[model samples]
Target chain A: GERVQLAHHFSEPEITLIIFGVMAGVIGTILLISYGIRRL
Target chain B: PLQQTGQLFGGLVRDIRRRYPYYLSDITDAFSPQVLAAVIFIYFAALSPAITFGGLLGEKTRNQMGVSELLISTAVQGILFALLGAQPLLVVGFSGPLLVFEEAFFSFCETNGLEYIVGRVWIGFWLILLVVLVVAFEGSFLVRFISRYTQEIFSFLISLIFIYETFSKLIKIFQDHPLQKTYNYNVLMVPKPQGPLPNTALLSLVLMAGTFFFAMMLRKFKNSSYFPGKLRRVIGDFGVPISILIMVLVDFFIQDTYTQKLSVPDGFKVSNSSARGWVIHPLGLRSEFPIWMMFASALPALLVFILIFLESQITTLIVSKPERKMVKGSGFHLDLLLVVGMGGVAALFGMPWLSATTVRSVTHANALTVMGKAQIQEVKEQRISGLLVAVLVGLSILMEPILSRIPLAVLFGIFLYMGVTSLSGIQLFDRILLLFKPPKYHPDVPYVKRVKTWRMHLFTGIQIICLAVLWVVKSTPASLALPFVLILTVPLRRVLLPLIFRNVELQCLDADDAKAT
Candidate 1:
């Protein structure tokens, strides 16, 4: 019998990845700003 | 709980695979149509002296204002981004619709010998006040009652508007210059002396055809269950952009003949919007006068606000479902407040009022979450995607000059694609038509349930007929068509049912069933 297959939804790692990804972006922004304004 | 989330993930991915190509094509078409409009506008503007070419920068016009026009445009857009726009993921800038609307309204004022600036102000005031009331009343709730059949009709109507608008302009251009002649660039600028471009209508048709064909092909190839997984997914993502770029490049090359003399209007330059990254003004009670005009404006603004609101919320819910998290019931109310605030702010300035856009919101939600084998969850790590987009808005202020140079044609394309894709959800007409077809022998074919099949077909037929009548009425010289179409709807449903329902076994599946399966 043919059956409909579904995709996976949520995972803990996905959550962790999102959290860290955003943190990284924020940190990256800060670093870039600091690097540009060096020794100011 | 985790497993349930996995199941949720599975459903979303499946749905995305089924719909994403269409969605991407939709985005592309939306932009493509807009691009086509821009080309037409420029084509006309080049000929006409009446149009005041003053939008991205003060350098592009006779008006000698020292202040940055880019800054003003961005500030007006940023407030929309921070407050009411449906999808903050996409940058809120000077949109083609807003620009066109502004120009048309301004021209109306100009032709009538009315004060153009005051008319614009009045329009803005009315628009803002209308948005405020719609948001306050949660007008999106009305969408729930509208069947998908009607939605498809409405979408098709809107898309047709774009198609007609583009075709009319193209036809006029081609008719004016019918001979194919090569310019200094050694490319065909126009076919004959009638207009500069030859076969403009054919080129537009080819682009449209190519877009739909490529999108459908991409979806078919990507969702082929027999294909190796990685290649399938890669092909899917490439479908929309590849199709769009192909059409654009083709158009560009074809248009190169006319470009030999790129005589940019004197003093025309693009510049950045003004933004010092500080809110110096106090946020106080804003625009309380002229209650009657505000109420009157709310009628149409209310309709627009509701459509966008429903589109945003429903899309958000679908994407968020994978996380087993839902938008708060009060979130809709809060969303309205933001929209109204954005509109109010934009009105105060001499800028066009904006609304929540649907495309970027879905894109953002999809990007922020991760999909498991069968479940999707919000990535708490990237929960700040919205904020990130907001920050991008701020950063974009600095790049206003470059952004300003992006031709209006591209934005038109986006709008065109979106309008096209939304029409896919119209379930009724397909169902009704299927009732007449012979059933497929294959058991593997996807079949609709009996009740829904009948209901959808009947419902769809009514909607389509009504919409067709409405379109004819609006476009025709006879002004009574619109009211006539609306009034006829009351009695038309009865006449439509017997024609659609009897002798109909709606469960029959055609070859397209294999595509769905």
Candidate 2:
């Protein structure tokens, strides 16, 4: 019996959105930590 | 200016010609038979685990290269460096930041449905071109602009990262395998109510703690009056690896359960079955090179270049510190050219890029140093590096079974020791620690003696801020920008800090060893 293959893919816009999201997450977390520590 | 450049080049060429044939003459009496054995032992024990961890955990997760391919490439690069390298003491290996960049590139290709191998090939090509530009323009001269302030911050951040990584992994070992619960006969009391730790976790903790304690104790007693001078030297040099071996033996005897080990391949073959042979084509057999991909790949390649340039030069600076008593001087341009050539070969085989690994290179130099009381009198430059790599190559073919037997926890202990020992020479770290002590008890180091306490703390605070930013960038998906973040420290020190601190105070706080006090 032959098995069926499923392809998983992302569109260009989706890839761009994901990249930006990750970048924002990193920057925001860093800023939040820095501010929190300074205030303490 | 033209004449100055010509003289510099002329002097460099003469040094290379003379140095290649007479490198062995630089070795002091410290290169004894006992020292040779100790150096080999340390290099084999320490570097094997590091290489395995980097290859498997770094590249395998991203499907970049196989364990065997990486090991072989490392061997070839090590030999080539020994023969033609400008700085023979500098150990070349995989870098964490570069690995992160490679993984990001892989992810980028996968998400966009492009050929990953082709992207790597393009990046490799761009790397060679960028290296060529650096050598031709003498870009390494830019190091003159980097002050001790920036160097301190960079070194501190990387060492802290190593320490943080070791502790985090130790915590994960426990969290991943929590202690099991047992039912009691009557009151449903937890079996051995006060206890019930997992055997594997307990053993791993013991081995790790034992190795660390043993290595540190050996180093502490290395200069004791009871031990003979020769024996003391052996104890100092061979401590880490010998401790590693002892812990491994203890682990073997008390083998209650199997713990994680370095996942070395069973044979001397590439892990990728589809790979035609040991040598790989940069572009895959089925993949077609598109023109647009080249343009797109160039952007990320630039980032990779920045990472390699900063890391290599910083490591070189640390090793070539005037205190190290280096006599052959530095060869920045020639070293970069060699790295570029090696990078090209690595790309063709789909192997990880090699660069000067700072901690390991420093360890190598320190191991060969002849000390006078508290100061280094001379460093023996010998064939230990080349021979150790040759041993690694031989082990790659024959010693997998033995290497796989060494527990991962013991290796982590070595990493922890490395992190702690590396912290010793960082003046900024010493300054930060001094802040915790009473001001009257502060050591009479130049900065402490001259700079006001508050000013010193302020300098450290700025360095900590930079460290935190670099750490966050390195830990997250945005790690591809780590090189740029590191470069930003220069401007922060040169331009931004002057606005806050007086120049006289800054001079005391940021002076290099030669200018201190």
Candidate 3:
């Protein structure tokens, strides 16, 4: 049987890059921003 | 385990003897004009959560449990727990997180083809036995390591559980019943020709928001200058019942609106009508349950006991915190023993295992704590006030029709108020508020004076970060057994924060100052 229909499946690159990728980008930015604040 | 028989029963006999002297005296001193008000305040405080989670507890098990059992649990635990407990002032009732576990345990049984009542009985069989050994061997001594850091983090999570649950539940109502759309023969109309028909989701928000606002303003009046202190005390103590009373009337005013009425049992019968009377049978005929599963229930029971044990000790820990300004000692051993007994008894009747609930117990302390001068007064240590709230909820089962009319939204508002009010005056919450303020405008506190500005930010940031992790872990699925993660808060305190902050910095930030106001 082809895997076209199922309740759940592995995330495709679109979701992987958008949700997980954007989440990391936000975290990375916040850390460096905080690092800059403490650099004073 | 052998050599540790130094105290034989560990804290069991020790705690009983220590508080024995107060037993007769707390009753003697308990009778006063102020206690009447305090008892009523405590009643309204305990009742809201009972009805709210009590409703969810009813649904989660598909009528195997209901408000009757919860009230029954409250009534029995309330009287028995107060009568026999180490700390008489500790208010016992149904808490929100405990209900989540019942929800987990019930579903865990359902998915695995195990009978629900039998599974809980076997679970209770193990749970009670574990608690007994824990007490007999004096495991209550382990709770001494719980510090203010762990207590603050736990309270923050408890507060957020109520807050987020409100948002999550009511949002589901809106999601389920969105604005109706229709297609005409010629044109597709998004709106009905009669215009917007009232849906429960919109009306529920109105009821909830109204109830919350009224309760908030009434409590805020306690600090307002308009009334005398005596007038304010009555108003403040009576705030919860009064708001619920008013909102209940508002529910009547909008009686035409179709909202979800509370699910109460028809009578004294069990929630699952098909079952044999109250006593749940662990040992049924062969095909009814797998025999090996009864022994295997111990595996989960031991895990669940950690949830029970840690929560039990910490409730007492927070109840007797230096900040609460209580001198009456805790019965870490005997209090938990009563719960062990409570759980076993509840299992026989197929009821949920409950122990000392934090919000109600802390609120009990606050109501009894005298206010005014520098040396105001000690907490109103009593046994009677707690007993009456139990009896009230006990009698509540008789007023089934009255409870049935109470709507879900009105109850949700009370849940929201309880969480928010419990949140107030928590130093962690107050500090989080300060993090929002500009640097120049920051308040002059002891911690601010000693600790650098960024250091304070670092402390608040990590707490918020840790609290967020706790919230996510608690709310998500397959995470039901996450009380293991709940125990993580303890080590996170001893392990994580200590590595980041110096002992001196930690002291200034988390100190229980005598002049806390």
Candidate 4:
């Protein structure tokens, strides 16, 4: 077995923020875009 | 103003008196062809997730818990819940909240440089005791305060967490095996570097997408005009499980492509970092685990107790819907009692705790249904399928060779589907979708017609606000107190909302079950 070298990784909170923001922002944006089209 | 001692065994006694007479009928009905078909379908439904979620649990905790823990934990809880629980018709299994709690706790442990199992064991110790206090005092009754408003928000939050985890795992696959700067217009590059298996990332994702949509198609197969009603019902019932089976078989042929397989540890070995025994001894500790830590763990358990307490109460209410025509009555009190006692057992072994999830319970309830026909006059509520599924989960260890062959991506697909479907149909989610639709064409529902679209969006926006805050809080150091964050929302709704919106407006906006009272 190879002894694994440690690598710098994003903290759990950092990744958590990204995933949350991405999903929430994209979903919200899609709804707004759909509304704009509907209004037009 | 209320009687305290009288409340102690009140729910328990009432549940037993209501449900016991039909216990024998439950068994006889369970063995029938109608119920038996459901038995196989729900069995795979339960087992697939048991292994899938268990694998995720193991990865999150760095292999301190995995498939073995999930199987045995579900087996014990399922069997017990089948025999002893008030609503035998309701399926019991590993739940999202319990998994989320463990994931949060595991991360908390890693950040603070603490022993994961040791910390978990102490927290379980506190939670088990807290459960006793809850059941003894009939705390299940408090869920009347935890109405649809809170339930919907909390429920959607859990769904988002599952979806997020699916993305997290998918991202890791790409990171580990990058597909950078390789565009072939004319010719295709074959797998040249053997050890670093090429195309694994692309192949794994395809399998995931395949499992998700294929299962979804079969689920809708029930409603289509193509198949006979009976045949479609059975196929749709087995849609998820069969989808899993087919995808695994698909991965089976392309085994050389080296897509990731399930991490099912050999045999019934304890999933511990230090190779400890089955029982997590309480006194077994280091100086890092302070004398006060056991007491401190109780605070986390308080939140656990609150989460399970409310969920357990709501679980019964949903399963005993008026349309089900539940003749045997309900065991709200009795079921709560059994859970905490067995919760102790889960704690003793340091395994993920179990609960009656809304989706699994509702899906199993519907499987025994035939729509387009009139109401089911007599739906048999039985324990056989419940016990059988648990026993199958336990026996999954015996099929490790077959089990280990299924790829991780297949399970990820299942996770994604469960989250999306569960997210669907909820009024809050519909309201989220509603914003995209033209307000002029909004349906003539009471909320839409009376409450005004702005009010609807206001409530929806507030819910999103609550849910977003909850996500951040759960990811923070105060994560164990996640239940309190949810429980306090009840107060926010009860006191805060009435002042903003009129009482009549709320009823149209987000009322509880059609008021029989």
| Predicted structure with the largest TM-score when compared to the true one | 2
Ranked by TM-score, the better of candidates 1 and 2 is: 2
How high is the TM-score of chain A in each model?
0.63, 0.71, 0.56, 0.63
Q: What is the lDDT of residue A5 in candidate 2?
A: 20
The reply for model 2, stretches above 4 Å from the true place, is A1-40, B1-18, B26-30, B33-38, B41-64, B182-197, B275-279, B390-394
What would the TM-scores of all predictions be? 0.50, 0.83, 0.81, 0.78
How do these models rank on lDDT, best leading? 3, 4, 2, 1
Weakest 10 consecutive residues of candidate 2 chain B by summed lDDT: B1-10
lDDT of candidate 2 over B405-486, digit per residue (tens): 8888887788778778777677788888977988899887667777788888888888888888888888787787776788
Q: Which ten residues in a row are the worst by lDDT in model 3 chain B?
A: B187-196
CA lDDT, every model vs. true structure: 0.39, 0.67, 0.70, 0.70
Judge candidate 2 at residue B15 and give its lDDT. Answer: 37
The number of clashing residue pairs in each candidate reads 69, 0, 0, 0
Query: How good is the docking of model 4, as DockQ?
Result: 0.01
For residues B79-114, write the lDDT of model 1, one tens digit per residue.
444333333333233323334444444454446544
| Cα error, candidate 4, residue B509 (Å) | 1.5
Per-residue lDDT of B428 in model 3: 85
List pairs with backbone clashes in candidate 2.
none
Model 3 residue pairs with clashes: none
